[model samples]
Target: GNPLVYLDVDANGKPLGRVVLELKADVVPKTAENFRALCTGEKGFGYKGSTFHRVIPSFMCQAGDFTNHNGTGGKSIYGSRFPDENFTLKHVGPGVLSMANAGPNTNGSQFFICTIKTDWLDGKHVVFGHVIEGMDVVKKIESFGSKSGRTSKKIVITDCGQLS
Candidate 1:
């Protein structure tokens, strides 16, 4: 079965809601596992307390930089980085979840959930999941984004974990 993980979000210390993600483990097992384990925090690090440092309106909201709470630092459970599992998945539309990397094969813990279709990222980013519920929560986060990828209000993952 596909893994379901959740993020309990907050904006400027006020609860926004939960954003649930359904990982396509069968399609991108390695990438999905990285996200799943991070959500579980079994490795001593996870998405908890991490903020969406880069939020671009009409694009995507990015997070998983638990190390720096910014875009510059994050490491996978495997190591500092890992190769893309595959590009079998595409950024077809909103709710699509994909890896955020510095370049090709530099996948780490960072990822983004698209608010709109971004075809240019196809083959460049590994798509491993999608939002199955609470997309409105994602939309609320998007409301805080700007054209410059900055957020007017701090959007954070106050808590996160696997569901069943």
Candidate 2:
């Protein structure tokens, strides 16, 4: 993985402060090559302005949607989705980084981290990797309701060095 998105969530699973994304190479071998190419400015690229904006609990924590000013706007401009990277990874369980897809094999830059157990999404969202630290922060997010849940307006992601 190249430009990784870090997500921080609250107890109820609402996204809070930025959670430092460190793109891992050994974990997500599915889109690693393409992702790497995008990182080293291969295709006139870079992903420093991305955000982990969407924070869904029962479903999954989503981000990489590069449309809105807050993150719930459009899709990643990269337009870099890979083929059917069928993975055995489980959905949305703390630590897991699952891919976001529009349909079968349509995964793009959008992805999510698991703050809960999303069994239905087990094989759907591409499994990228897991969180190694900052689990408690994810459980303290200010959550109310989806139609009612307050959306965070200050979640930020700074380059915390690079992935190992």
Candidate 3:
């Protein structure tokens, strides 16, 4: 079965909701495992307390930078970065989860969730999972975004973990 994980989100210290994701471990084992481990935080550093540093209306919201809490930091369990697992999964529509990278094979801990169809990123990013629940919460976050990709308010992943 696919691995399930959750992020309990908060905006400006107010609880928004939980975002549950179902990772496609079957299709992207390495990429999925990286996300699952980060959620569980068994590696000492993870998504907890990280902010959704970038958000764009009609596009996507991004996070997973536990280090700098901004776009410039965060690393994979493998090391500072990891290779793109594969391009088997496609960024076909909303809620699609894909890794963020500086360039090819530069995947780290950063990731994004699409709010609209983003077929343009299909081959560039490694799609590993999709949101299974709390899409309303995602939209709420999107509402805080501006055209410049900056969030009006701070959106944080207060806590995260793997769910059985």
Candidate 4:
């Protein structure tokens, strides 16, 4: 439950591989708890069929919402919202894993995997992780503002499981 997924997306919107992010036990609990329940739990499997429908190439890639509709933000799945898991970490740069929110504390299972050194985002979003693999894949996704963000093709999280 403490581990977060740091994903890499190819140009086709397909996932390359994901590294684990163990939330600093003392860092963010509620946010970590929320993600675990929605991602690592048995029901978390609901997201395996989802797509990273929205991607801001040269910036970030997102997943965990099963709805294929991209960027029309809101909790895309059915569930209760989580309380604000206030944390000091924010989007300081690439690979930074911050909870994606439609509004303050509105984040369900969606999270962003950043690509560029996003200095301005620090002190803003809740950063709990970083990418540990496939930065090349992360860099290959089509740019959102340029090519509609998602690949006409797709990069998918075909399966997820504990490392052992």
What is every candidate's alpha-carbon RMSD to the true fold? Answer: 0.6, 5.3, 0.6, 3.7
Colliding residue pairs in candidate 3: none
Off by over 4 Å in 2: 1-27, 33-44, 67-79, 140-150
Number of the candidate with higher TM-score, 3 or 4: 3
Model 1 lDDT vs. the true structure? Answer: 0.94
Provide TM-scores for the models.
0.98, 0.64, 0.98, 0.73
Q: Tell me how many residue pairs clash in candidate 4.
A: 6
What shift in Å separates residue 159 of candidate 4 from its native position after superposition? Answer: 1.1
lDDT score, candidate 3: 0.94
Clashes of each: 0, 14, 0, 6
Candidate 1 vs candidate 4, lDDT winner: 1
lDDT of each: 0.94, 0.51, 0.94, 0.58
For model 2, how does the per-residue alpha-carbon lDDT over 30-149 read when each residue is reduced to its tens digit? 455444443343455443445456665444455555545354443322464555565655564566666667778776666666667768876666675666656554444324224333
The better candidate by TM-score, 2 or 3, is 3
Q: Per-residue lDDT of 23-98 in model 1, one digit per residue for the tens?
A: 9999999999999999999999988889999999899999989888779999999999999889999999999999
Q: Over 4 Å off in model 4, which ranges?
A: 1-15, 67-69, 72-79, 142-147
The 10-residue segment with the lowest total lDDT in model 4: 5-14
